[PDB]
Amino acid sequence: DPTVFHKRYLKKIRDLGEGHFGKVSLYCYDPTNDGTGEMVAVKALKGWKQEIDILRTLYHEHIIKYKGCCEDSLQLVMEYVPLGSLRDYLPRHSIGLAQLLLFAQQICEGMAYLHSQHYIHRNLAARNVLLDNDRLVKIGDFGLAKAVPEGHEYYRVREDGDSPVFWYAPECLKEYKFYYASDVWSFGVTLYELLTHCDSSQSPPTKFLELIGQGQMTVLRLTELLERGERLPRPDKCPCEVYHLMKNCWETEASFRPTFENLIPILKTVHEKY
Ligand SMILES: Cc1ccccc1-n1cc(-c2ccn(C)n2)c2[nH]nc(N)c2c1=O
């Protein structure tokens, strides 16, 4: 059985990031001592194992590949995505706009599948969308991902620690209810990030805080500003056609947002424009 990795052949290289509930690091796995073995990403895990059992059930060219784990409180071993998050990639190479859209499209394709499998990612951001060799997109960090019980469209989570609250839809901040349609929202927020090339002095949190005037009175107020109808600016050089698409993902009422199913053909249509 290949999905069992032996702690005795994982020599580490460097840390990679902080994931949700786990630190992540690059490892070289050589169980045959042939002198090269294989390259993998390992997430040191702290119901805290849920990332594992979800990712294990998913097979898709835009979701990060589950390779197996590691035991002695345990450790997720994933396919290695060489180029890291777009959050770091974008602000450091200039990219075409058509290219920015083709990435958006790909995240929809993965997300559509995720949802078709009855999961919510709960964490979709430029941070957590990784690039491989051919510039193919892979959705990562399933730290917050959740099973949606069959029969229902949402799922209630009372947060313990940090939440990407600036990527979340009202229903989530307001009521702690996450629908499939909440991932669509976040996808909208991501799409903005893409088109701001993740410039940090353009990021969602810096923008939303300007709109107000920090503190723990923020989430109440941010709910109130999203609820009054205010949104992120139209990124510079971002076309109307696109900014509308985002705005649609940002419908206040979840039942009004488009689905990932629908987003796919619409994005192919628009990527084709340029
Ligand atoms: C998505 C995420 C969230 C949180 C923490 C780590 C990652 N993360 C980061 C990378 C990475 C960082 C730098 N580089 C060059 N690559 C990576 N590569 N391959 C993977 N599976 C993965 C990965 O999960």
Side-chain angles (χ1 to χ4, degrees):
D1 187 23
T3 47
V4 190
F5 287 67
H6 290 308
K7 209 218 147 73
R8 327 183 277 88
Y9 313 96
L10 291 154
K11 200 215 69 185
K12 178 187 168 158
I13 333 285
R14 56 199 183 82
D15 302 300
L16 283 179
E18 209 74 78
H20 231 127
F21 305 128
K23 209 229 293 281
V24 173
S25 307
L26 179 61
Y27 279 69
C28 166
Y29 188 64
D30 190 359
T32 38
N33 296 98
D34 63 339
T36 306
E38 209 176 306
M39 286 297 189
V40 304
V42 188
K43 188 175 182 149
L45 254 65
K46 296 206 166 282
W48 42 250
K49 41 84 233 315
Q50 247 201 119
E51 186 164 355
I52 272 171
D53 312 298
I54 286 163
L55 200 44
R56 170 187 288 132
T57 59
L58 306 182
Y59 332 87
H60 199 272
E61 73 167 306
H62 299 293
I63 299 286
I64 204 154
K65 215 101 294 130
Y66 170 67
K67 289 186 153 285
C69 42
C70 218
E71 200 70 52
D72 296 292
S73 200
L74 80 175
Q75 287 174 18
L76 170 77
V77 190
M78 312 158 275
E79 86 161 309
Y80 187 49
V81 200
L83 283 62
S85 76
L86 284 156
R87 202 255 193 98
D88 299 330
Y89 188 91
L90 292 177
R92 287 184 289 179
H93 322 68
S94 97
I95 327 284
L97 199 94
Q99 183 69 100
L100 277 188
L101 293 150
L102 192 96
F103 293 170
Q105 187 196 243
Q106 279 160 47
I107 293 170
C108 288
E109 301 188 310
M111 281 303 307
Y113 169 70
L114 185 58
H115 281 198
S116 88
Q117 295 284 71
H118 301 64
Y119 297 121
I120 35 153
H121 185 231
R122 287 228 300 154
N123 191 263
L124 184 56
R127 259 214 74 158
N128 308 325
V129 180
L130 306 144
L131 276 185
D132 80 11
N133 297 282
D134 303 53
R135 309 148 198 160
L136 261 60
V137 132
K138 316 274 179 171
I139 300 153
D141 190 359
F142 284 69
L144 295 164
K146 293 282 177 278
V148 175
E150 247 136 84
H152 328 310
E153 278 143 28
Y154 64 94
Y155 175 67
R156 204 170 291 272
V157 202
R158 255 296 193 170
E159 200 39 69
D160 251 332
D162 215 42
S163 252
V165 289
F166 287 97
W167 284 250
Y168 281 14
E171 66 265 29
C172 313
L173 333 164
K174 187 159 191 143
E175 295 132 23
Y176 320 103
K177 285 159 86 193
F178 308 71
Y179 306 61
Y180 295 98
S182 293
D183 277 339
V184 162
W185 184 287
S186 299
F187 167 74
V189 194
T190 288
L191 174 56
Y192 171 91
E193 279 186 62
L194 263 41
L195 284 137
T196 70
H197 302 77
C198 300
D199 161 27
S200 29
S201 65
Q202 271 280 110
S203 70
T206 46
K207 281 304 165 166
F208 281 123
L209 281 151
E210 285 182 13
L211 278 160
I212 300 164
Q214 194 77 291
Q216 36 55 47
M217 268 292 205
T218 296
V219 168
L220 166 75
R221 295 292 130 154
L222 169 62
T223 310
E224 289 180 46
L225 94 92
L226 282 183
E227 268 182 355
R228 274 188 270 90
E230 294 202 77
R231 291 297 174 273
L232 292 161
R234 176 165 142 251
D236 192 62
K237 306 169 179 214
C238 163
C240 270
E241 216 171 335
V242 179
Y243 185 57
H244 186 221
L245 164 69
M246 311 194 184
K247 280 183 97 190
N248 287 145
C249 301
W250 299 337
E251 291 293 321
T252 296
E253 199 79 43
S255 31
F256 302 149
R257 293 165 216 168
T259 67
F260 287 110
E261 203 72 305
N262 309 329
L263 268 11
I264 294 158
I266 280 145
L267 279 171
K268 291 171 162 169
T269 282
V270 303
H271 163 77
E272 199 203 340
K273 263 60 194 160
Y274 340 101

